[PDB]
Amino acid sequence: GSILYLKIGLIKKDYKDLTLGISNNLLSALSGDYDGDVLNIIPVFDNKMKEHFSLLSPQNFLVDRNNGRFNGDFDLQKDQILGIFILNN
Amino acid sequence: MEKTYNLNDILLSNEYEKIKEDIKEEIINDMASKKVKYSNTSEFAKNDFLKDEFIDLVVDGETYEITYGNLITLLIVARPFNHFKVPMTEDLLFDLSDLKEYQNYYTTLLEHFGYSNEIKSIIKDVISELAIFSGDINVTFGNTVSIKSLIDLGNKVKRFRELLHYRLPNDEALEFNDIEAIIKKNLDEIMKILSETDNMLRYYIDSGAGINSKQFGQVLSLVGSKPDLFGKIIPYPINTSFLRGLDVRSFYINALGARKALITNYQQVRNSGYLTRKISMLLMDTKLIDLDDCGSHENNYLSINVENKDVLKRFSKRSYLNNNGELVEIDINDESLIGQVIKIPSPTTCASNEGVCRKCYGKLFDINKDLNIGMIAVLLLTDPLTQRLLSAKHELSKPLREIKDLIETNKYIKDHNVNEVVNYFIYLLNESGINIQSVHSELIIREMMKLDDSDRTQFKNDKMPDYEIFRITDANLKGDSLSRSLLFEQVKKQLTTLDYDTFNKTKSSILDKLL
Amino acid sequence: MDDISVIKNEDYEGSHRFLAEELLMPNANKTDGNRSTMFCSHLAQAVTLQKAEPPLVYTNFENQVGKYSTAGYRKANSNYKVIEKIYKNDYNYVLIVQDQETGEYTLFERAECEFLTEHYGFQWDNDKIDSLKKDDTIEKDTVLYKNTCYDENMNFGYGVNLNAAYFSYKNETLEDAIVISESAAKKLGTFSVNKVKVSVNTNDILLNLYGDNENYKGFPDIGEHIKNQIIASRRRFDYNTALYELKNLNEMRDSDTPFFADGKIVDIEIFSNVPEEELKVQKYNEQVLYYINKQKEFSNNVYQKLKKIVEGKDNNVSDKLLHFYNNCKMRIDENISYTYQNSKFSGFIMEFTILEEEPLNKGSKITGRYGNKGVISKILPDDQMPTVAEGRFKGLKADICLNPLGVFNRLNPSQLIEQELNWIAKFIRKDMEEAGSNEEKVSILLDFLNRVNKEETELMEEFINSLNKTELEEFLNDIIENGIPICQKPFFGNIGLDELWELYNHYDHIDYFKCEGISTPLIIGEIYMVRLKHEPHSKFSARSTSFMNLRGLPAKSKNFKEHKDLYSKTPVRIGNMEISNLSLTNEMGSIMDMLNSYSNNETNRRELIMQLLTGNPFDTNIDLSDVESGTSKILKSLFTCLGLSIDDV
Ligand SMILES: [Zn+2]
């Protein structure tokens, strides 16, 4: 799953902003870091193409094709693990 | 806040999101209003945050005694019950005290709800919301770090005080193993005393996020010896510690270690991930065919001996012939299988000529019907193995090279048989430390296969035909489909010479459409 | 090795000859090698700061490296006497001076900014030189100008000190994310200079982009700012198309050539190979003619002024003087053709040098002095940021909040040392403010300095004994309003854990800062910051439909270098594992369809554009043909011409 099928949700209003926002939980699955990696985007147009690539949506990768359990790459990362620990314990 | 609730009610009621929002707002407002006091000792200061309580919950006909936070998270995760309007049952409850258990919890849900798409969507939603809630709680609770905490702890506890104030007893000659043992014991003591007592980093080390034991022990306790660029320990280990200071000779040693790390990183990046190229290029054509049973012979089932539970982990979601010979599901938790040689179905022995039957893939088949099974196998093998090899280069590396040779050089295959080679592969996988389902490995062996008659029907008879296996590049070049051969390397001899009979060879393939 | 046994601490004791780069970073005695290497690379990557300040914690070597480095100022080699001054343009001028003793003449010049390389450069603080007038003696140590890195007294400044606290913000400081306030980001202002040249032949003509009919200016003047990120444009004139395309000269046509930049015009240089008569009868070349006349007048004046010097053989001049005068004499004389890149051109070529300031862009990088790199994740109004609102320091605000995930993994406890030192300094500043009499406050000041650095304390006591009473009071005012500097040696003489232990033991009045609404009493302290160069704008290629190569396939182009494209627009290529992972899904036909529709097949891509342009914008129902792709056909040519052939099944 080093490729992801993602859906646009919001257009940034600030003209000078040129960075791509991405949720934290997708960092591990695509194996990246905010240090300066350059990632590539390919738009998709055909509706049939949308349906075919729906299998590449992160929701599909949520199931582990290895062991069939909940995927650890989508599991909570560092800071949120800490925070939930504070809440629970 | 109320002494008791009935979770079944809050999920069935329409005010579910309202109650959750109210509860979250109360937590944030309350705990933001209050303040945190550190006892800085083994004893605990009196902090009366309402986030921790002893509230009750009446569900399934029984009353559980949990805190406020457990309640909010229990409602936050039980969202599927609300969405599908299905009551919760006791077995569907887990002690949320341990975070890792949440993992298991998620998995078991995917079982009672039929592996549907909707439950996958709702799982994604609840994960996202839990992340956002952790974000707001993490602003409204501080997590700062400074060494003043350490200083005050040392003032309070003299044990930690003298522990940080320690050097190697250089009065006697010290061996490498002795210094490693002493530094290990000191690091364990540091972590133990840190966890025992209250401090501004207690939660940090209890949770474990953002703290590495090794780096911690190196920073506070003594640094310890470092290897030379060629991999030899220096005779003079660094008696000092990073916090305390350094020696000019120690400074030189540290600089040498850093330059060694930089050189290793350079060569590691230069490696370029070349093996995945050919392994994928060969394995990608493999397919799956929806058929109940290949109908292979009983002797076609390959035999494997059990030495530890690790091989049982490697052999989940599959079936073994029992005393009656019926293929019953293998149970990893089961222990009666220790020290036994038993036959298992495999793709490398499947009698389906169209592809692989669902019997060989075991119960796992239903999960994988969407995707190219072989491609998952190859990628899921090449990723952790390369990562482990590269980290080891950054001892344990030798088995990894052995695995690479077994796949590539093929001397062992030329000297032995399929059962032996697969058992060796399982043993090598265990040594390497990575864990992958054995089904994918057996599928790589199925691709590895080579026999005289392309038909698998003979395979279903009593005696199997010739079972030879060649080099990975040789095996791909062996592949009668020319489309994949041309896309490989070494095309020169393929096109201009008759050694590989590429003029003769012909077979359909996926990439054949690509041409 | 035995050499490893050879080196002894006694050999190098009380000397720093071994350490070269970390001379600029305090307290190298506690850091790791990887972090030191990172810091050395960053110091190779530092950029100019508009609001540069000298760091609070200093290692006595910043002044040295500044003084010895000679790419940031111009010190007169000896005492000279200025004989004359000339000005080329509004913002630049030159000075003709004579040596007082040697009797030799020399040139100086001024400019608003200096072009270092491509984007990078810096603005020049020319106050000192501009203050000079005619017939005034210059002195040997007088510096005509300096970069902003240098303070009033040649104090080195390569970064600025900012208030920082360790704090996790909405799970948003995960990894190396850094959040900064608006005021601090407004501080980290950095210059940038670009040089861009445009060619005008006999064919292409300019357009009156700027101003009315009377004021025909295709490019902004010196004072003007470039508008709409466009400097000028050219229309490709054709004799046949003189009836439709050339019409409406004021408005640009669709098929023209513009140029793209930003900032304000700093200087203009024109080279013309055409006779001036044509320019005289050219209305759309009035601006260039005016500039050429101005430049020619400048050259005439300089030649006239310096002729008496140059023709006098008895006079001694620098080779620079002769080179400059010969250059101007070249310019004035007629029949002087210019041949750019070893080839004559037609028309003229003109070069603009432009300067502009940038604030911090979301996504830039900032690092301390120990390699603690990061990326500016999001910026906030300062009111929406943790503040302390208790005690004497009620209302203090922290500009930036670093990532408190772990410093122990990065192996550099030195940042914490600097932070707690500066926080303690804040508290001492408050205490000495509370002091009433000068003698006792200087006593407590030197007391603390002795607790931290005794010898530097001795130097302070010598200084304060040297200072006069009123000056002394002004000094304490400067201390209370700025702060107190702390000297910290790189490797020999720095602080360790024990001195901090003693400080906290004696300083029982020290207390955690109780921030409002925040559960833990976090700590705020000054830390030095420097901004790197790696900006998100440096990798922003995005292409829709650009020039195809001879194979009818996408290919990069040279428009971006010539400033013809706003964005870089260089396409991405799909490689081995790309096709592999796309084929992880059982849709090989779909992948082939995508590849054919995007680039491979000309007919398929054309029909994609046709279908996609019209039809419902919200719903795209593409239809694909089965024409053979260009790649397959050219491979067929390869095989057939090799003697190979094609035969399916
Ligand atoms: Zn089978």
UniProtKB/TrEMBL annotation, chain A:
<protein>
    <recommendedName>
        <fullName>DNA-directed RNA polymerase</fullName>
    </recommendedName>
</protein>
From TrEMBL, chain B:
<feature type="binding site">
    <location>
        <position position="294"/>
    </location>
    <ligand>
        <name>Zn(2+) 1</name>
    </ligand>
</feature>
<dbReference type="InterPro" id="IPR038120">
    <property type="entry name" value="Rpb1_funnel_sf"/>
</dbReference>
<dbReference type="InterPro" id="IPR007081">
    <property type="entry name" value="RNA_pol_Rpb1_5"/>
</dbReference>
<protein>
    <recommendedName>
        <fullName>DNA-directed RNA polymerase</fullName>
        <ecNumber>2.7.7.6</ecNumber>
    </recommendedName>
</protein>
<keyword id="KW-0862">Zinc</keyword>
<feature type="binding site">
    <location>
        <position position="357"/>
    </location>
    <ligand>
        <name>Zn(2+) 1</name>
    </ligand>
</feature>
<keyword id="KW-0548">Nucleotidyltransferase</keyword>
<keyword id="KW-0479">Metal-binding</keyword>
<dbReference type="Pfam" id="PF04998">
    <property type="entry name" value="RNA_pol_Rpb1_5"/>
</dbReference>
<dbReference type="GO" id="GO:0000428">
    <property type="term" value="C:DNA-directed RNA polymerase complex"/>
</dbReference>
<dbReference type="GO" id="GO:0003677">
    <property type="term" value="F:DNA binding"/>
</dbReference>
<keyword id="KW-0804">Transcription</keyword>
<dbReference type="GO" id="GO:0003899">
    <property type="term" value="F:DNA-directed RNA polymerase activity"/>
</dbReference>
<feature type="binding site">
    <location>
        <position position="350"/>
    </location>
    <ligand>
        <name>Zn(2+) 1</name>
    </ligand>
</feature>
<feature type="domain" description="RNA polymerase Rpb1">
    <location>
        <begin position="245"/>
        <end position="450"/>
    </location>
</feature>
UniProtKB/TrEMBL annotation, chain C:
<keyword id="KW-0804">Transcription</keyword>
<dbReference type="GO" id="GO:0006351">
    <property type="term" value="P:DNA-templated transcription"/>
</dbReference>
<keyword id="KW-0240">DNA-directed RNA polymerase</keyword>
<dbReference type="InterPro" id="IPR007120">
    <property type="entry name" value="DNA-dir_RNAP_su2_dom"/>
</dbReference>
<keyword id="KW-0548">Nucleotidyltransferase</keyword>
<dbReference type="Pfam" id="PF00562">
    <property type="entry name" value="RNA_pol_Rpb2_6"/>
</dbReference>
<dbReference type="GO" id="GO:0003677">
    <property type="term" value="F:DNA binding"/>
</dbReference>
<keyword id="KW-0808">Transferase</keyword>
<feature type="domain" description="DNA-directed RNA polymerase subunit 2 hybrid-binding">
    <location>
        <begin position="291"/>
        <end position="547"/>
    </location>
</feature>
<protein>
    <recommendedName>
        <fullName>DNA-directed RNA polymerase</fullName>
        <ecNumber>2.7.7.6</ecNumber>
    </recommendedName>
</protein>
<dbReference type="GO" id="GO:0000428">
    <property type="term" value="C:DNA-directed RNA polymerase complex"/>
</dbReference>
<dbReference type="GO" id="GO:0032549">
    <property type="term" value="F:ribonucleoside binding"/>
</dbReference>
<dbReference type="InterPro" id="IPR037033">
    <property type="entry name" value="DNA-dir_RNAP_su2_hyb_sf"/>
</dbReference>
<comment type="similarity">
    <text>Belongs to the RNA polymerase beta chain family.</text>
</comment>
<dbReference type="InterPro" id="IPR015712">
    <property type="entry name" value="DNA-dir_RNA_pol_su2"/>
</dbReference>
